[PDB]
Design a protein around this nucleic acid. Structure first.
Ligand SMILES: [Mg+2]
Lengths: 287, 83
DNA sequence: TTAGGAAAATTTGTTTCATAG
DNA sequence: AACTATGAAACAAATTTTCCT
């Protein structure tokens, strides 16, 4: 009954409302292929499942909380043409689910009810992977697909306003890696200790992610608005066996220490050559 | 249904030097032949092979590795030699 | 079911031989 | 006699799909 193309940006909050995301999806989750059995819902790091909750909605009437697998690349958010949310039901499921479909994106509607304070426990969302040859070979689609295997659980809701104005809120989750192989080999950074410092550095930054090994090297880099790399420093990383999935790196010092404006830098992790994480965000501040 | 009067190299060079950033991933070059000439909408096993071969053997076609895989590009001063 | 593991296939790149012009 | 553009393949390594248990 509403009209919000899945590709349109939406803030996570507006007015007194806020579309939180209590628990988060774990890092890895092997999507399943149509030619195979189901691989379950998206479990949480804890052992349970994700959880989203509204806030400013204090009226008493359920609301439909949408769910679709979104893209997770650099560019803005948009439906991931290679992955579809897949509805699981019955036995090991306590969330009634409705399954729509918009454009080419499958959407799973879950209800948020005042009974639980608008707090749904997403335990019925699965991930289906479509074959690439069938998605790339579509009259219009110019999206890649090869090595394109990370997603974001996108949530969306439409709180109706007594003024006759549909108020849309939306929020994505942290990226999940659906490839079996790109889970055993590619290192991933889930949480970073700090995100900046003066062009001095030296300060330690702890990284929390997966597949971090004794050879996990970190590298900072910089590039202009066109893509041409103009700086490549290999920040010093450490090794701690007691500490399971963390990494301690020493922020290298920016090239031009004589800067009057803050800058934008990126850093990743590399275990071999192909095994490389995504570019992480960081900023160097003036002395 | 008509063998276009161009060499693979010439076309591989055209598809590239026509894309938004003058660089293309192999699959995209394929997508260019396919939607540009009806002759390429069949026998893919044969011409796709031909393209991969032209792309490696001629020095004017250089493979530039990146985060998202690898793209192909043309070096004009080179494509302007021996032809 | 759901989870793991891995065989089968495919994709992408390199090189070799051969033949018609 | 030597090339070139084409065909048809062999192989290897990275990745994606399909099967099994
Ligand atoms: Mg070449």
């Amino acid at each position: 009954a509403s009209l919000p193309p899945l590709e349109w940006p939406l803030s996570s909050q507006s007015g007194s409302y806020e579309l939180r995301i209590e628990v988060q999806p774990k890092p890895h989750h092997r999507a399943h292929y149509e030619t195979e059995g189901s691989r379950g819902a998206v479990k949480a790091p804890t052992g349970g499942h994700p959880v989203v909750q509204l806030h400013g909605y204090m009226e008493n009437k359920p609301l439909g909380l949408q769910i679709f697998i979104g893209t997770a690349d650099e560019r803005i958010l948009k439906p991931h043409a290679f992955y579809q949310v897949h509805r699981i039901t019955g036995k090991t499921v306590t969330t009634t689910s409705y399954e729509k479909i918009v454009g080419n994106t499958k959407v799973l509607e879950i209800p948020l009810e005042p009974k639980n304070n608008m707090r749904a426990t997403i335990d019925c969302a699965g991930i289906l992977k479509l074959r690439n040859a069938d998605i790339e070979l579509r009259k219009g689609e110019t999206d890649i697909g090869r090595k394109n295997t990370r997603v974001r659980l996108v949530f969306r809701v439409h709180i109706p306003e007594s003024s006759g104005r549909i108020v849309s809120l939306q929020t994505a989750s942290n990226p999940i890696e659906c490839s079996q192989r790109s889970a055993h080999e590619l290192p991933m950074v889930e949480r970073q200790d700090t995100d900046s410092c003066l062009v001095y550095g030296g300060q330690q930054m702890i990284l929390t992610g997966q597949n971090f090994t004794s050879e996990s090297k970190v590298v900072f880099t910089e590039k202009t608005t066109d893509g041409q790399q103009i700086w490549e420093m290999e920040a010093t990383v450490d090794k701690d066996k007691s500490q399971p999935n963390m990494l301690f790196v020493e922020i290298p010092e920016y090239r031009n220490k004589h800067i009057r404006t803050p800058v934008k830098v990126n850093f990743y992790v590399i275990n071999g050559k192909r095994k490389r994480s995504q570019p992480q965000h960081f900023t160097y501040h003036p002395v | 249904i008509v063998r276009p009067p161009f060499t693979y190299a010439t076309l591989i060079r055209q598809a590239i030097m026509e894309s938004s950033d003058r660089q293309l991933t192999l699959n995209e070059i394929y997508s260019w032949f396919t939607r540009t000439f009806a002759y390429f909408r069949r026998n893919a096993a044969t011409w796709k092979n031909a393209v991969r071969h032209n792309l490696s053997l001629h020095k004017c076609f250089v493979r530039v590795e990146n985060v998202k895989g690898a793209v192909w590009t043309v070096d004009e001063v080179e494509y302007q030699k021996r032809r």
